[PDB]
């Protein structure tokens, strides 16, 4: 079942039920049936039958252990975020999956206003809340992309739920390309990192999987772990980006760049 066919199975009542979950996510993981019903203005027994069907379609997860409650699955939060995008007129048709990992699923899509785009659906103080965390990641990526506009990153078009709509870049991940000028490519990445840093942004997950390259130049993507300069740990997070990208170039190309000196250079500007 592709996300487009799933979308086709939803009626108005289905969307209202999902809106009622979404609007109560901040105070419950599993939103009580009574509250889904009251918010949606759908009687309890009918709301219950909707949620059972949504669960059969893997859009919600229903629990009954302590009380009758429901929350989004990944697919469901994504479907609902897509809906917000369609209703807002920013997306007209979802397209094919481009790829999926542990952190996101990225789809092709078409917008009359913005052309052929990507929509990226996000997955995933006490170290040991799926939806609120995925939505927070999405918003973080959207805000970083907005702050970076004009640099070599995708243009950003919208954020709803766990979804960020952005420009399709026609370029390959660095890790799939054998560049013949690695020293110059590494310097271009490091210069872009300095530009982010001058805008008050640290990427936070820089790697060979989110530098894109073409004959035209490089682009950088993937900002859900980004932080603002002078956030807790920002400097160490920045050093890690610089060290990690330099280390990939050392392993792959035996480039000679010194990590500590590259960091001090970016930091001094
Ligand atoms: N705007 C874009 N244009 C072209 N391809 C993109 C775009 N966003 C994502 N992709 C492709 O989809 C992949 C996954 O997106 P990405 O933003 O890196 O999320 P992630 O897979 O969840 N984290 P990671 O693999 O660590 O970079 C990329 O490595 C790109 O190959």
Distance 184 CA to ligand 1 centre (A): 23
Helix (H) or strand (E) holding 214: strand 211-214
54: closest CA among 91, 86, 22?
22
Backbone break loci in the chain, preceding residues, C–N > 2.5 A: 124, 128
Ligand 1 pocket: which of 115, 209, 224, 248 to mutate (most atoms within 8 A of CB): 209
- In CATH terms, is domain 91-171 a member of 3.40.50.300? no
The Cα–Cα gap between 79 and 73 comes to: 10
Give me the residue spans of the domains in the chain. Answer: 1-90, 91-171, 172-269
Helix axes 130-147, 74-87, angle to 10 degrees: 50
Pick the atom of ligand 1 nearest to 205's CA.
26
Distance 106 CA to ligand 1 centre (A): 7
Helix (H) or strand (E) holding 250: helix 234-253
Q: What is the resolution of the experimental data for this entry, in Å?
A: 2.0
**Three-state secondary structure call for residue 25:** coil
Give the CATH H-level superfamily of domain 172-269.
Transferase(Phosphotransferase) domain 1 (1.10.510.10)
The Cα–Cα gap between 119 and 140 comes to: 15
Residues designated as active site? 205
256: closest CA among 189, 183, 174?
183
Helix (H) or strand (E) holding 142: helix 130-147
Cα-only R_g, the chain: 21
The Cα–Cα gap between 44 and 35 comes to: 9
Helix axes 259-268, 234-253, angle to 10 degrees: 140
Instruction: Pick 1-90's CATH classification: 1.25.40.10, 3.40.640.10, 1.10.1740.10, 1.10.10.10.
Output: 1.10.10.10
The Cα–Cα gap between 24 and 131 comes to: 11
* 230: number of Cβ within 10 Å: 9
Q: Which amino acid residue places its CA nearest to atom 28 of ligand 1?
A: 210
Tell me if 1-90 shares its fold with 91-171: no
């Amino acid at each position: 079942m592709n996300i487009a066919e799933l979308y086709g199975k939803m009626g108005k009542h289905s969307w209202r039920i999902m809106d009622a979950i979404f609007k109560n996510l901040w105070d419950y993981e599993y939103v009580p049936l009574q509250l889904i019903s009251s918010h949606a203005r759908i009687g309890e027994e009918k709301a219950r039958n909707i949620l059972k069907y949504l669960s059969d379609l893997r859009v919600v997860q229903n629990r009954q252990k302590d009380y009758e409650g429901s929350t989004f699955t990944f697919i469901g939060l994504s479907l609902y975020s897509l809906h917000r995008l369609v209703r807002s007129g920013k997306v007209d048709a979802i397209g094919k999956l481009m790829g999926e990992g542990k952190e996101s699923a990225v789809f092709n899509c078409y917008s009359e206003k913005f052309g052929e785009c990507v929509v990226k659906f996000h997955k995933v103080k006490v170290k040991e809340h799926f939806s609120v965390l995925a939505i927070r990641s999405a918003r973080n990526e959207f805000r970083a992309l907005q702050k970076l506009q004009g640099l070599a990153v995708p243009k950003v078009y919208a954020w709803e739920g766990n979804a960020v709509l952005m420009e399709l870049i026609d370029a390959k991940e660095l890790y799939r390309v054998r560049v013949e000028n690695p020293d110059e490519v590494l310097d271009m990445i490091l210069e872009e990192v300095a530009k982010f840093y001058h805008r008050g942004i640290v990427h936070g997950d820089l790697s060979q999987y989110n530098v894109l390259v073409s004959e035209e130049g490089i682009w950088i993507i993937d900002f859900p772990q980004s932080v603002e300069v002078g956030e807790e740990g920002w400097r160490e997070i920045l050093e890690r980006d610089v060290r990690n990208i330099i280390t990939y170039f050392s392993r792959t190309y035996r480039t000679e760049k010194d990590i500590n000196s590259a960091i001090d250079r970016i930091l001094q500007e």
